[PDB]
Amino acid sequence: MREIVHIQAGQCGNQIGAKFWEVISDEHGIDPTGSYHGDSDLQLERINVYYNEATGNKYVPRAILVDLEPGTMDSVRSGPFGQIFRPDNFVFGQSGAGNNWAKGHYTEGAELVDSVLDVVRKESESCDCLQGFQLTHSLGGGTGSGMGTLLISKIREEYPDRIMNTFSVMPSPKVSDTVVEPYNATLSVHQLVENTDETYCIDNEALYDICFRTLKLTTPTYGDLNHLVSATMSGVTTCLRFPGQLNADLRKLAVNMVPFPRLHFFMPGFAPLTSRGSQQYRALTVPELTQQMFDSKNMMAACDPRHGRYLTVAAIFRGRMSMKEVDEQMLNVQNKNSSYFVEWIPNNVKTAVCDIPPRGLKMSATFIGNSTAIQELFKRISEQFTAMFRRKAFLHWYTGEGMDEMEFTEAESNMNDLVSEYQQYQDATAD
Amino acid sequence: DLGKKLLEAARAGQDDEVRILMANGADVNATDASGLTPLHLAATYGHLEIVEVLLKHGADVNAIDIMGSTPLHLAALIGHLEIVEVLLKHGADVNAVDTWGDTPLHLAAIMGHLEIVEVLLKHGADVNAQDKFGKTAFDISIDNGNEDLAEILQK
Amino acid sequence: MRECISIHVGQAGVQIGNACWELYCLEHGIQPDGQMPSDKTIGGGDDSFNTFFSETGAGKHVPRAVFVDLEPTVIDEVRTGTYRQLFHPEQLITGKEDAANNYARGHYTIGKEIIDLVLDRIRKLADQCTGLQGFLVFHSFGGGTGSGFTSLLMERLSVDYGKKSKLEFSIYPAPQVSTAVVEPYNSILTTHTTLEHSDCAFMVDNEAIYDICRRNLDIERPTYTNLNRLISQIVSSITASLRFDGALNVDLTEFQTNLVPYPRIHFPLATYAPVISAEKAYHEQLSVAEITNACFEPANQMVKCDPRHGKYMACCLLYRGDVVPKDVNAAIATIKTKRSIQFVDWCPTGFKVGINYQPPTVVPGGDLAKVQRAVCMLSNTTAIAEAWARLDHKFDLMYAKRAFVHWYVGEGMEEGEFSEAREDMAALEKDYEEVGV
Ligand SMILES: Nc1nc2c(ncn2[C@@H]2O[C@H](COP(=O)(O)OP(=O)(O)OP(=O)(O)O)[C@@H](O)[C@H]2O)c(=O)[nH]1
Ligand SMILES: Nc1nc2c(ncn2[C@@H]2O[C@H](COP(=O)(O)OP(=O)(O)O)[C@@H](O)[C@H]2O)c(=O)[nH]1
Ligand SMILES: COc1ccc(CCc2nc3ccccc3s2)cc1O
Ligand SMILES: [Mg+2]
């Protein structure tokens, strides 16, 4: 297993996806034309995981760009690396999704999904040993949420032996266009619990709180939030893209991080937290890196880890640092915080270390937690879903697309079952 | 029946049809099957001009549907700030309770409409009002970790 | 001859195998390209090293060795490293997709695609043998390939070579040097399905080897290369009797006779002395009495446990170097007189002794100092059940919640096999309790 096929759907999915590709292109020495210009051979060793090699020492993202509205095409192409994508992998429709999960999942999106699968099929056939799929999307819209989850279901049925992994950004009133986002997100979470193996929960509530309260940005923009998203996506994929000793891949991560199939929603974290063009993060040591990494303020999901228990944890340290010091700091955190790691999964905290740091930093750490405290995120969406649904507000936008009202009650029911599952393992004892 | 047409005109935001229908005798306080009035629907879908028109022609600002929802409940839930203040100006009950024990303050807090929250507080929203699970708006803000909301609610 | 075929499965087995065959070549005077000047036989040959090396017409000595992994990364290093020319290229076998730390993928869904190629390649080596005695199998407990594919391979080898002995060198997992949360599951699953197909299994506790590197070799953070060079030194001690002239453990059958009284409790404990850092090149040389005494300190054991809390069923001492037999006998007498080491009542309470008078070899590149005499003690003690108990407890904690079980059921395995394997381990622990109390 090596190659990953990347899909970005909808406005949010394509915006964070484009950022992802310009970030890792820089780490791997790839310029906006696809040519390599790096100073380390480690940048090429695992390049095929995300890139197809082209005719003349040129590298093309294994990325499929999808949206039901054409406006996001132009913007992505206008971007710094917009020309590096394969033009045939732009699969876009004419009329958008109107922030309506049902349009994305049942009407407009169902018309376009077959065109997308033709491109996915092609990209998979040229893979020496495809390991799985990675999707970037938001859950609060219509395309990334409605058509995204439909794409996941259809890919799941055609490539059932492959890993399905998503970067799913959760809506928040703090960064909100409409009050139907809880509808769209709850319907999507229903699909995600069943058809993905691993989901990275990127919470816009957390991203806004970081920018506003920690970074002191009085009025955060999408570029501010996406600064944090791209840093997080770079960190969690570091071990897929560079050698190291772990020989990490999407299936080994899933096998070791997901003890129960439905509880596969990860809480990511990052340290140091910086804003664009600041350079303030300088004197950062291994004890500080480790403390911040587990700090609730550094989580990309708006959840307090100390209100739950960690089932599993992976920590990725990047940069030159004392591995002797990482191990003593990592053991230190586990011993003084013993009450926040379940006792019935021995050795459930994994340390990975990568030589090559990200741009602008010499030391950095990335956190991936499977914590029962993520139920706070789903309880927040659920309360908003219920507040709207009990008043039947805007429901005709969904039933008017052939959708049945019981689909809402079943999504509501499934998400509340998911919350009860987390609580069950939060209170379970070894005994 | 002009009432059904007024209900659909108010929902759709068809200002001119609302004017003509009331000119032909349409029941400003007509109800659909669940007890929603034209004012309920105009307040839900953000039609400020229709809200003001209905209130000038005898709409009951505090009417309840079958579930106890008043127009202010729905405007506070959806987030229509200016409609909230028109409703309060015309005598809306800031502390009306629906069948789930929710007040307008509960619904604005849950949906994160912080400016509406502030408005309701200045108009005497009951900070001790509990829903059927015993939660006040401040309880909701503590449970969901909404620090901005919690600060607003402590004045 | 009476040839032996070594099989290396998964990363741990392959990398340990690399270190072992490097050491073997140095012990026998074989260059990386297979050439051997010291002893001049044209082709074939019937010397003692021929148990482990065939000979081509051109004077090339080729390991009787197979390396298997389900992904190519580790074996690709063997194909490009110092000993690329040493091995049969067709005996380095790789798939494209590993077991993802999953016993069920190694045994069922992924291992099934390559098992028949591995067996046909093993058959090719077997067909070059005038008197094959059996197999030495190297693998980890915790890996998906090392656990799952090894158990599948051992099952098929029992059908295809019913009369041949099978010896295991098995890496027992440690938290300090681990790769997966599910390693207790894979360890219990493979032990259960391999138990009836293995005649003798030497467990290597990665934590014990880790401890020795840190305390004896002053290596703060041991690498796999550090661990493996120490492991290979101990494996060579155990197999030297098969590769040189000797009077103790001269064939694989004799391992069982001397070390395995009952077929299920076939897990001897290895203890090796002395382990001295290469920076202490001018260390005072330890006597036979001293290195023999060191064989009864827990700090030199390959598996962490307490033999004082157990009883002995067999005990072999394999000396290497400047070792006079009378000094061994005096040292043994001191052990029985002063030490409270208890044998069960139904075994000969004696110690079997072998002496190879060649000094131990140390690899250039290693962390071990040259010594004039060394000793490996192989003992079958009920105390090694403590190691099974530690593994079973980690298994029980996760299984009680059915944590991670769905990954195995989703890969061609029934949930019923978890309890079957665990109850077999419970029966193994009772076997040790009944023998020693
Ligand atoms: N002593 C030693 N242990 C190793 C080595 N490599 C891996 N291990 C240990 O072996 C276990 C992991 O099994 P591996 O052999 O790496 O995995 P595998 O057999 O290739 O199976 P998969 O990778 O899951 O397909 C862990 O306990 C590691 O600590 C090694 O070179 N030397
Ligand atoms: N972090 C982040 N969130 C976004 C971005 N663009 C849209 N969103 C969020 O995505 C949701 C709207 O979905 P969107 O992707 O715009 O609609 P779609 O095109 O139909 O999928 C809302 O929750 C927005 O806050 C972005 O660039 N960054
Ligand atoms: C919780 O314990 C563990 C967790 C994970 C792993 C291995 C695989 C990984 N794959 C990735 C991929 C990307 C980033 C980090 C990682 S760790 C082994 C463990 O013992
Ligand atoms: Mg492996």
PDB file of C-alpha atoms and ligand atoms in Angstrom, chain A residues 236 239-240 246 248-249 252-253 256-257 312-314 316 347-350 368, chain C residues 179-181, ligand 3:
ATOM      1  CA  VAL A 236      -1.312  14.259  10.408  1.00  0.00           C
ATOM      2  CA  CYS A 239       4.156   9.979   8.421  1.00  0.00           C
ATOM      3  CA  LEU A 240       2.394   8.936   5.201  1.00  0.00           C
ATOM      4  CA  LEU A 246       6.929   3.639  11.434  1.00  0.00           C
ATOM      5  CA  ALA A 248       2.819   4.434   8.508  1.00  0.00           C
ATOM      6  CA  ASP A 249      -0.220   3.997   6.293  1.00  0.00           C
ATOM      7  CA  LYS A 252      -2.228   0.739  10.367  1.00  0.00           C
ATOM      8  CA  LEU A 253      -3.414   4.073  11.777  1.00  0.00           C
ATOM      9  CA  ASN A 256      -4.378   0.993  16.143  1.00  0.00           C
ATOM     10  CA  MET A 257      -6.577   4.083  16.664  1.00  0.00           C
ATOM     11  CA  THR A 312      -5.983   6.023  21.789  1.00  0.00           C
ATOM     12  CA  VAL A 313      -3.515   8.786  20.973  1.00  0.00           C
ATOM     13  CA  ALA A 314      -0.843   9.372  18.347  1.00  0.00           C
ATOM     14  CA  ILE A 316       3.917  13.249  15.795  1.00  0.00           C
ATOM     15  CA  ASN A 347       0.151   1.116  25.515  1.00  0.00           C
ATOM     16  CA  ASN A 348      -2.466   3.305  23.848  1.00  0.00           C
ATOM     17  CA  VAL A 349      -0.213   6.362  23.315  1.00  0.00           C
ATOM     18  CA  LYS A 350       2.093   6.192  20.295  1.00  0.00           C
ATOM     19  CA  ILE A 368      -4.359  12.781  16.987  1.00  0.00           C
TER      20      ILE A 368
ATOM     21  CA  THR C 179       4.621  -0.806  16.898  1.00  0.00           C
ATOM     22  CA  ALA C 180       0.950  -1.674  17.530  1.00  0.00           C
ATOM     23  CA  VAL C 181      -1.713  -1.633  20.226  1.00  0.00           C
TER      24      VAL C 181
HETATM   25  C1  LIG D   3      -2.214   4.361  19.558  1.00  0.00           C
HETATM   26  O1  LIG D   3      -1.184   3.427  19.169  1.00  0.00           O
HETATM   27  C2  LIG D   3      -0.792   3.452  17.856  1.00  0.00           C
HETATM   28  C3  LIG D   3      -1.301   4.303  16.883  1.00  0.00           C
HETATM   29  C4  LIG D   3      -0.841   4.203  15.581  1.00  0.00           C
HETATM   30  C5  LIG D   3       0.129   3.268  15.227  1.00  0.00           C
HETATM   31  C6  LIG D   3       0.641   3.106  13.858  1.00  0.00           C
HETATM   32  C7  LIG D   3       0.294   3.733  12.735  1.00  0.00           C
HETATM   33  C8  LIG D   3       0.244   5.153  12.467  1.00  0.00           C
HETATM   34  N1  LIG D   3      -0.085   5.621  11.296  1.00  0.00           N
HETATM   35  C9  LIG D   3      -0.052   7.011  11.291  1.00  0.00           C
HETATM   36  C10 LIG D   3      -0.350   7.833  10.202  1.00  0.00           C
HETATM   37  C11 LIG D   3      -0.281   9.210  10.345  1.00  0.00           C
HETATM   38  C12 LIG D   3       0.078   9.780  11.555  1.00  0.00           C
HETATM   39  C13 LIG D   3       0.382   8.981  12.647  1.00  0.00           C
HETATM   40  C14 LIG D   3       0.315   7.604  12.508  1.00  0.00           C
HETATM   41  S1  LIG D   3       0.631   6.356  13.680  1.00  0.00           S
HETATM   42  C15 LIG D   3       0.646   2.433  16.219  1.00  0.00           C
HETATM   43  C16 LIG D   3       0.189   2.512  17.522  1.00  0.00           C
HETATM   44  O2  LIG D   3       0.682   1.669  18.466  1.00  0.00           O
END
